[PDB]
Write a protein that binds this ligand. Structure first.
Ligand SMILES: CC(=O)N[C@@H]1[C@@H](O)[C@H](O[C@@H]2O[C@H](CO)[C@H](O)[C@H](O[C@]3(C(=O)O)C[C@H](O)[C@@H](NC(C)=O)[C@H]([C@H](O)[C@H](O)CO)O3)[C@H]2O)[C@@H](CO)O[C@H]1O
Ligand SMILES: CC(=O)N[C@@H]1[C@@H](O)[C@H](O[C@@H]2O[C@H](CO)[C@H](O)[C@H](O[C@]3(C(=O)O)C[C@H](O)[C@@H](NC(C)=O)[C@H]([C@H](O)[C@H](O)CO)O3)[C@H]2O)[C@@H](CO)O[C@H]1O
Ligand SMILES: CC(=O)N[C@@H]1[C@@H](O)[C@H](O[C@@H]2O[C@H](CO)[C@H](O)[C@H](O[C@]3(C(=O)O)C[C@H](O)[C@@H](NC(C)=O)[C@H]([C@H](O)[C@H](O)CO)O3)[C@H]2O)[C@@H](CO)O[C@H]1O
Ligand SMILES: CC(=O)N[C@@H]1[C@@H](O)[C@H](O[C@@H]2O[C@H](CO)[C@H](O)[C@H](O[C@]3(C(=O)O)C[C@H](O)[C@@H](NC(C)=O)[C@H]([C@H](O)[C@H](O)CO)O3)[C@H]2O)[C@@H](CO)O[C@H]1O
Ligand SMILES: CC(=O)N[C@@H]1[C@@H](O)[C@H](O[C@@H]2O[C@H](CO)[C@H](O)[C@H](O[C@]3(C(=O)O)C[C@H](O)[C@@H](NC(C)=O)[C@H]([C@H](O)[C@H](O)CO)O3)[C@H]2O)[C@@H](CO)O[C@H]1O
Ligand SMILES: CC(=O)N[C@@H]1[C@@H](O)[C@H](O[C@@H]2O[C@H](CO)[C@H](O)[C@H](O[C@]3(C(=O)O)C[C@H](O)[C@@H](NC(C)=O)[C@H]([C@H](O)[C@H](O)CO)O3)[C@H]2O)[C@@H](CO)O[C@H]1O
Ligand SMILES: CC(=O)N[C@@H]1[C@@H](O)[C@H](O[C@@H]2O[C@H](CO)[C@H](O)[C@H](O[C@]3(C(=O)O)C[C@H](O)[C@@H](NC(C)=O)[C@H]([C@H](O)[C@H](O)CO)O3)[C@H]2O)[C@@H](CO)O[C@H]1O
Ligand SMILES: CC(=O)N[C@@H]1[C@@H](O)[C@H](O[C@@H]2O[C@H](CO)[C@H](O)[C@H](O[C@]3(C(=O)O)C[C@H](O)[C@@H](NC(C)=O)[C@H]([C@H](O)[C@H](O)CO)O3)[C@H]2O)[C@@H](CO)O[C@H]1O
Ligand SMILES: CC(=O)N[C@@H]1[C@@H](O)[C@H](O[C@@H]2O[C@H](CO)[C@H](O)[C@H](O[C@]3(C(=O)O)C[C@H](O)[C@@H](NC(C)=O)[C@H]([C@H](O)[C@H](O)CO)O3)[C@H]2O)[C@@H](CO)O[C@H]1O
Lengths: 114, 114, 114, 114, 114
């Protein structure tokens, strides 16, 4: 598996606008909401769960990087894998998207896969 | 279990106004006091205790997040489970609430379960 | 044991003014000095040693919180247990106080046991 | 092995201009892009991958240091070992360079193996 | 062993002016360069290696404290043990000094052993 697999999805020129931390099934988790830097479009919601999914190994690195980009407000590309989380009330509150990567973006491109 | 279980309680549009770190019965712990951003209501107190209660796995994540939201003064939703801590002097100083989640808030919503 | 045990000692309305990190007996340790926010009184010195005393489990949380309050310069209540450290040159440089808690203070009260 | 081995390569007077975090083949990784502080030259890209390559033990220290130098934007010397990553889509997006060291370039010259 | 052993050396009122992170013999390490706050004298260089020397246990605490003092620019007392590192190209680049402690300094005296 790789963040950049074309079976994942990504959204460019976004800003992390909200942050949530909690616990589910004895696992810490966090979620972020991102919006376009220009405010257009629909928010992207993605979560990472410390003990669950093939992306569990990257939990701490992604939590620290989400916190960093949240604090700076800078433009990023957010990479997700769709249809991962399945607890129905959790998906209703957040989404089924697993967070799988974060890339900084300049005005002309983003530093990350496609 | 989940932060968003309907048997937990939550308080929206709160500001983390105080922070305390200590040790009890071999466990580092922290407590926070939150107050409504608009001055309404009565303060909420919640604590997380390392290696104690079902919420133990998220101790470090919640401590780091509470420190961040405390440092910014931003409005948050605080999620608790009531009647968890039983040590009587501790409860009298702080409360029996276990901290189980923290959510950022916007002008119209908070980014977490309700 | 608890930070708030009345056999411990505390000092309100203090500012963390100095910070030292070192090693002793293969254990990382740190010490702080605090002074009254209003400039009066006698400084308080307290140390924490990663592998020593009943307070060892809280070493990392107290170090992070000491660094936080040191960086903000805000007024705090410092909680200690007297007569813990015993190596004479160490006590002469610093003190025998073990650090056991740190509480934020407002103008009127401190958020911690009293 | 050593960061300063002559078989490694380095680039002075660079600024960390982009940062990416993801996961590949069970491993969290990060990549950085650096450009000459004075605007000349060609960017350098380097990556560190947890639990992969001989440089695995320093993954967390290099991630933390890359973040710090990225946040200040100060001039640095980046140390790499060429031709380490072989995953072809990854190399095309980023590079085959393993990040093996970071040195400040305050004042006089770069504070690292030369 | 202790940071304050009289067989160690220390240098007061120093400013951390450079920082380097790398790897050697499968161990992360860092080095700092310090200079007197008034610019007199000659620089002090010291390094910490995570898996080597009796000071290995305090590697992370020292790296975190070095980063903090490097970012503030405040005057510190640096404590070292001489003639510890032995790889010749490493010693010639940096020094043989092991970093063994870091103390903040008031306007009149440093907060650590002397
Ligand atoms: C490397 C390469 O060949 N092309 C990339 C390319 O991805 C991208 O070009 C377009 O740039 C605009 C704004 O910069 C958008 O980025 C475009 O749409 C994308 C995006 O956000 O990147 C593409 C993405 O695949 C889409 N994801 C899904 C699930 O559909 C999203 C999504 O539709 C929207 O984001 C929702 O609002 O849109 C993109 O085509 C740029 C980006 O920097 O860089 C090129 O090099
Ligand atoms: C390929 C695909 O999309 N899904 C398959 C699916 O056939 C199946 O799903 C998993 O199987 C059982 C229940 O049938 C597990 O209980 C998983 O449920 C949980 C889990 O405990 O792991 C419940 C948990 O609440 C979920 N966490 C959240 C935040 O929602 C997790 C989580 O979605 C997964 O762990 C993510 O990978 O799932 C259930 O998903 C199994 C059977 O082979 O395989 C899937 O791939
Ligand atoms: C994987 C592991 O280590 N432990 C899981 C364990 O988490 C799981 O417990 C369930 O976890 C879910 C979240 O994933 C909920 O927190 C459940 O709370 C319940 C409850 O226990 O009463 C269940 C569910 O949320 C609801 N009722 C159901 C499914 O019947 C109610 C809730 O009030 C709703 O509002 C009504 O829909 O709360 C909790 O049971 C257990 C059981 O799946 O499995 C372990 O593997
Ligand atoms: C009438 C009047 O106003 N007298 C003032 C008085 O307000 C004040 O006394 C101190 O006030 C602070 C208020 O935060 C504390 O209540 C001090 O009590 C404590 C403390 O919390 O710091 C109690 C504690 O048990 C004591 N610790 C030990 C080991 O004995 C400490 C300690 O004695 C002092 O902190 C050391 O300086 O005191 C209370 O003493 C002061 C000035 O504000 O003195 C009068 O002017
Ligand atoms: C030989 C000499 O000159 N002095 C030693 C003295 O160092 C030491 O004192 C006592 O030893 C018993 C156990 O033998 C206690 O454990 C205490 O020792 C130590 C310890 O646990 O290592 C010594 C250590 O230096 C102390 N650490 C600091 C920072 O001061 C700790 C510490 O106070 C406690 O751990 C706190 O709970 O205590 C001490 O009572 C012994 C060495 O055999 O004998 C003297 O002669
Ligand atoms: C203790 C442990 O876990 N592993 C060591 C292992 O690190 C050590 O390897 C030597 O490490 C030193 C630094 O301490 C040098 O990096 C040596 O590097 C070499 C190199 O990597 O190529 C070896 C030799 O000196 C030269 N190259 C060879 C023989 O291929 C070059 C040359 O000096 C540089 O180019 C200088 O610019 O450096 C490395 O062998 C081994 C052997 O000491 O012992 C393990 O236990
Ligand atoms: C003034 C003139 O005529 N030409 C200058 C030229 O002298 C100068 O070259 C660079 O100067 C800097 C000074 O810090 C470095 O010394 C560069 O050396 C190194 C470097 O450390 O960056 C050495 C290193 O071994 C080289 N790495 C590799 C893989 O070969 C790098 C690398 O070639 C360059 O960094 C790539 O751009 O160079 C030295 O080259 C500069 C002015 O600063 O450019 C001309 O104007
Ligand atoms: C508990 C563990 O894991 N290891 C300890 C080990 O740390 C300890 O070594 C002693 O540690 C103390 C600090 O706790 C000092 O660093 C000691 O240095 C001394 C020394 O050289 O012996 C100790 C003492 O203060 C003095 N020695 C005397 C009076 O004989 C000298 C002093 O500075 C003068 O220079 C002497 O003329 O410093 C160090 O030995 C050992 C022994 O306690 O126990 C292990 O278990
Ligand atoms: C004779 C003199 O002038 N000084 C000596 C010194 O040369 C000598 O070297 C030590 O001897 C041991 C014996 O096994 C090893 O050779 C040590 O090797 C290494 C190691 O641990 O791998 C090599 C390594 O590269 C070194 N790391 C760095 C950053 O340089 C480490 C490190 O220095 C030690 O671990 C420090 O504790 O050492 C080598 O140090 C011995 C002779 O006993 O000490 C002086 O007297």
């Amino acid at each position: 598996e790789w963040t950049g697999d074309n079976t994942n999805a990504y959204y460019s020129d976004e800003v992390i606008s909200e942050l949530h931390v909690g616990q589910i099934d004895t696992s810490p988790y966090f979620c972020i909401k991102t919006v376009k830097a220009n405010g257009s479009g629909t928010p992207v919601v993605a979560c990472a769960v410390s003990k669950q999914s093939i992306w569990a190994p990257s939990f701490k690195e992604l939590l620290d990087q989400a916190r960093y980009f949240y604090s700076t407000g800078q433009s990023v590309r957010i990479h997700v894998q769709k249809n991962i989380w399945t607890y129905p009330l959790f998906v209703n509150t957040f989404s089924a998207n697993a967070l799988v990567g974060l890339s900084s973006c300049s005005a002309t491109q983003c530093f990350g896969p496609k």
